[PDB]
Paper text:
The VP ORF encodes for two overlapping structural proteins, VP1 and VP2, sixty copies of which assemble their T = 1 icosahedral capsid in a predicted 1:10 ratio. The VP2 monomer extracted from the refined 60-mer capsids of the BuVs contained the core β-strands (βA–βI) and α-helix A (αA) observed in other parvoviruses and large loop insertions between these secondary structure elements. However, unlike the animal protoparvoviruses, the bufavirus capsid contain three separated protrusions surrounding the 3-fold axes, as has been reported for members of the Dependoparvovirus genus, human parvovirus B19, and the HBoVs.
VR-IX is mostly structurally conserved among all three viruses, with only the BuV2 residue 540 being conformationally different, VR-VI and VR-VII adopt different conformations, with BuV1 differing from BuV2 and BuV3 at VR-VI and BuV2 differing from BuV1 and BuV3 at VR-VII. The melting temperature (Tms) of the BuV capsids determined by DSF were 64.9 ± 0.2 °C for BuV1, 77.3 ± 0.3 °C for BuV2, and 73.4 ± 0.2 °C for BuV3. BuV3 does contain two cysteine residues, C59 and C520 within the same VP2 monomer, at a distance of 3.45 Å, positioned to interact within a hydrophobic pocket, but they are not engaged in a disulfide bond. This proximity may be contributing to the stable BuV3 phenotype compared to BuV1.
Numbering used by the authors:
A (entry chain F), D (entry chain R): 33 to 572
B (entry chain Q): 279 to 474
C (entry chain Q): 524 to 572
E (entry chain Q): 33 to 82
């Protein structure tokens, strides 16, 4: 079976099983990876440029406004490649995902398995004068593929889908790997308050800190498997433990939850029910009259104001500190202008391989995300007054501008929820005394360690003369292609109608033209965005 | 028993760059990449604006004087170190991050009898959790173009602790640190203890 | 306590006396008076994420 | 599995297990060897030049001072290659070794195993005019690798790490083998006393002695295994029996061991305790007054004076006869001058492959070794007097200059201890009626025979015409690469604090800059020296 | 044992035991306290300077 016998098999499908109360989703995915010879065989540690728009030192125009962009960092570059199925688009066909968000309220992940077979390694031999050279691709029956997977998570994570670097979303195209590399400590700290006018900026510390620097090769961390052609590999089943993520969006605010303020029903249509003057109810503060639905007591609050957009200048900073996920559509925001970015708003740049139509072209999305309302707290629109009494506040004692964090013990908020195709699936939980309460971009945060990372490198083939010179043309050019078959099982409880009138069922974005989501004459098509969070529901 | 050097910038996938051929040289940032971003930014794609599912450390007003019944008193901030900034022992000695100073008698390990000595833990090894509120900013809208003079603010002084943040306790301290502490009975207990 | 195992290749900086302090002050004197050192600690680096 | 199936596997790690009283260390190492076709297929015996700085005959300037350098010898050159893991740097990651010398008092070796798989043999075919020739590397599915291991130790040793010739210290780089060859008797004897003034030098005997010469091929000594590609090989577990080597350095001398001479404690600080005039105690000689701590009796002595540096002119000589391992730091010696070489002081030259940063460059170390004090006996500083009495000696009867061996039944001394990375691990014990009591450079000396040597040669592939002419271009050019996975288990008892105040824990050398021990932008880095012998302890 | 018999004992040490995966630390401490007669035998409640 080593040669002339195929070890692996192709399965790409997803199947549902309803037990009458809960759904079990088993989704298979298999891809054809094109792996290439590592640029250098040795680890490296180096420091980087700040970025395209970062100012050259001494540019005080725009003051410290333009310093946010770096994008400066320092890292160790391993000669390894990282195949991670952390995107949603891997596992779910667009129509097979549409059935998930349609029929299910919320979902968990259970298991993940991975298998690498069957390997094919070839070498490039160019014979000819040069003007008319002829390449010849002939395979090495004896050559190695190195497969390193760390179940103990000794390595830094760097498997997050961000900077997409993930397997393609289209089963029949080939995939390219991205190189595995991770951070080592450095100080980017930037002082933007320097000056007599406080406006000017400068950078006090830059560069790598070598005293405490940690350097972890792949060889020492994990056990490596050397695979020839007839070999196969498997990671074994990995069981997540995670909380379910809601598939439904909340339209309620603190105003939409409660007992509505008693009013007199209209006799004729159209008419508006008048507010009843004399009622009895709890109120905040000293108010007796008027009794209002704004000042009425409630035992929790929904959403919180946050400074946006916060630039944290840290070691390595600046960086953004996220706010709430709410939608700006209740305010004047629309796609096509004025396009308010206020609530935490993610924008996905993606390659042709990730579902762009044009080859070698870039496209973006910018999730609004328009369906989350009632969680909307936009700090520029807010106020506080000193004393709460029957009379309205004086000109003094009433403030409106800040810009303050209202997160507190009472607040209740929602995560962004899953996102398709480009959303990450799971994420690692940092080890600190206080773990985050909820994750920003990742639906699932592994309680125990995250699924081990799977690294792959094409073992070097050397020419007869190893050292010469000078290290010039030491290895013979080589490339490999292998197949990767994963499966992950999910568990979801199915939705039942809670209302009388008909829902608006999920689907393609509203304005988009349906021809762009189905292949073209050339064969290029784009996958749709599903939020989702595609169904409304009641919070309270 | 271990200190964290990572910040929100040190955690993640590093922004793709082109490795240097010669030493010393710096790897140039790749112009065209694909990745998530906050806000409406498409170009430039930056490592500052890139999305991450949690944040490390939080800005805090310092030093807060709470005037209470019996007050004033200090309300603590994060335990981070000021060594990434210009702070050094022997000047300028920034007290910013929560910084404890231990006065101790001869009986407690001072050499001279009947004499007093101090320490002032920095604590220099906690970095990447460092958020010093005077150095921070917020801008109204996040877009490809940099913010206008208006809509970009820097001075506050606001609490960024939220559901996303991840932070560290001061950890044990020797010799003078306390070992255990009592938990107050309230409906909301503290999530993490400052000195104990 | 659960014991530490090396997670890196190169050698750590192991804990000890504060950097600038003179080691003679932590061991008894002619009169017999000495001072104990500060250990943080939190004396080892590690990875958060 | 012969073709297309990978026999071997990659494991490079070391793991500790504490039983609460003793540590068990299991360290794996695996390397990628690049083996090349032997220069000639036939054994050879030949004589060599004296050396670079050895005088041409009749050069009487410098007298016999410059004759020490040869470096002259005669040997039999086998067409075989020797892969020996005799260095410490093979088995221990720098941080994984730092934990050994930190937590353990002393250590033994228990077992060693070795495995050679998986073999890849290729041939070089150059087709083209010559101006624009194109090499083509295509593998021989049928070709042999010869693996010879002698468990019975019929061959001379020549496996000592000296002249480093050992596997690299960095797991991801490739290794080159060194050719196996050993000595045959010869007479180099040099007379440096010839002349009327006794100063001039000449060589009386030179050349090989063919009468009693012993010639041992590899084929007759050991059984050889012929391995094709799909084959694997293993040496079986080899159990050492050896004594533990101390991980701690001794600061005590004969003066530091004992009961201190009674004195009157100082009342104020700072002050010095005055020596008590009238005490009762044993003394050497006839001394009653003054009673001194120098003349007081003690039942053993520490360290011994030795002539340094002794040049033994032997058959094949000159050579150095070692002294004690002590440090010169108590005297005026410092790195950066004046740099006294007196105590036995080893200097390690090492290649890029052995942990030098620059490729094809040489670097040195010169272990001081600064931490061994109290064993320091430097013969130029010493004296003897005829009679030991109350009065000090006369001008006559008091001598200071020699230069004499004080090793005797009373003396107690220390071996150099292990050394990292470049130190040897084990060594062979010569068979003589009097074996050495302690080894100079090697921590472990096998009581029984040493671990068998592992020789490997690439079996010859012949062109159709064997004899032609004339022996011109008889074999087709060929090279091979295979993987070598050893493991050796150690046993060590863990250290517990014997003092109140905090230790100085082991680590990087003091003055060195930490950035040089972690990879560079190009990826080149250097391993640190650990002594060690990194902890102080009490001798007595 | 009430008089002329010593009830207590002096142990000041700490000892570690490694199970190969986890450490068990047992630390003893013993001190000699000098206790003095209370200034007043009665409880008190009072207010202080700033």
């Amino acid at each position: 079976s080593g040669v002339g016998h195929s070890t692996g098999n192709y399965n790409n499908r997803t199947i549902f099983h309803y037990h009458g109360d809960e759904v079990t989703i088993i989704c298979h995915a298999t891809r054809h990876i094109h792996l290439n010879m590592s640029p250098t065989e040795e680890y490296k540690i180096y420091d980087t440029n700040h970025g395209p728009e970062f100012p050259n030192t001494g540019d005080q125009t725009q003051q410290g406004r333009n310093t946010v962009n770096d994008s400066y960092h320092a890292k160790v570059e391993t000669p390894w490649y990282l195949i991670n199925p952390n995107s949603w688009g891997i596992w779910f066909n667009p129509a097979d995902f549409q059935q998930l968000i349609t029929t299910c309220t919320h979902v968990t992940i259970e298991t993940l398995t991975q298998e690498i077979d069957n390997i094919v390694i070839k070498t490039v031999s160019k014979q000819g004068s040069g003007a008319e050279e002829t390449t010849q691709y002939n395979n090495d029956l004896t050559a190695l593929l190195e497969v390193a997977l760390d179940k103990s998570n000794m390595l830094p994570w760097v498997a997050d889908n961000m900077y997409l670097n993930s397997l393609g979303y289209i089963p029949w195209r080939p995939c390219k790997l991205t190189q595995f590399c991770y951070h080592t400590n450095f100080y980017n700290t930037i002082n933007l308050l320097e000056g007599t006018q406080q406006n000017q900026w400068s950078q006090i510390k830059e560069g790598i800190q070598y005293d405490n620097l940690q350097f972890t090769p792949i060889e020492t961390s994990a056990e490596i498997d050397l695979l020839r052609t007839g070999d196969s590999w498997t990671s074994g089943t990995y069981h997540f433990k995670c909380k379910p993520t809601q598939l439904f969006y909340h339209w309620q605010s603190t105003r939409h939850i409660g007992a509505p303020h008693p009013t007199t029903s209209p006799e004729q249509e159209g008419q508006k029910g008048q507010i009843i003057q004399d009622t009895n109810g709890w109120q905040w503060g000293d108010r007796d009259n008027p009794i209002s639905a704004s000042t009425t007591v409630k035992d929790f609050h929904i959403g919180y104001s946050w400074p946006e957009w916060r630039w944290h200048y840290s070691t390595g900073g600046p960086s953004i500190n996220p706010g709430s996920a709410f939608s700006q559509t209740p305010w004047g925001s629309e796609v096509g202008g004025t396009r308010l970015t206020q609530g935490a708003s993610e924008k996905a740049i993606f390659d042709y391989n990730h579902g762009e139509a044009e080859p070698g072209h870039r496209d973006q999305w910018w999730q609004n995300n328009a369906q989350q309302t009632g969680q909307t707290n936009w700090a520029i629109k807010n106020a506080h007054q000193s004393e709460l009494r029957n009379a309205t506040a004086s000109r003094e004692t009433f403030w409106t501008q800040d810009y303050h964090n209202t997160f507190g013990p009472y607040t209740a908020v929602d995560d962004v929820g899953i996102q398709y195709p480009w959303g990450a699936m799971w994420g690692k939980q940092p080890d600190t005394t206080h773990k985050p309460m909820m994750s920003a971009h990742a639906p699932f945060t592994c309680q125990n360690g995250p699924p081990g990372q799977l690294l792959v490198k094409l073992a070097p083939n050397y020419t007869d003369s190893l050292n010469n010179e000078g290290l010039q043309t030491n290895r013979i050019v080589t490339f490999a292609t292998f197949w990767w078959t994963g499966r992950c099982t999910f568990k979801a409880k199915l939705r039942t109608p809670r209302q009388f009138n008909a829902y608006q069922l999920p689907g393609i974005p509203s304005g988009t033209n349906p021809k762009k989501f189905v292949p073209d004459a050339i064969g290029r098509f784009e996958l749709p965005f599903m939020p989702g969070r595609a169904m409304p529901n009641y919070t309270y």
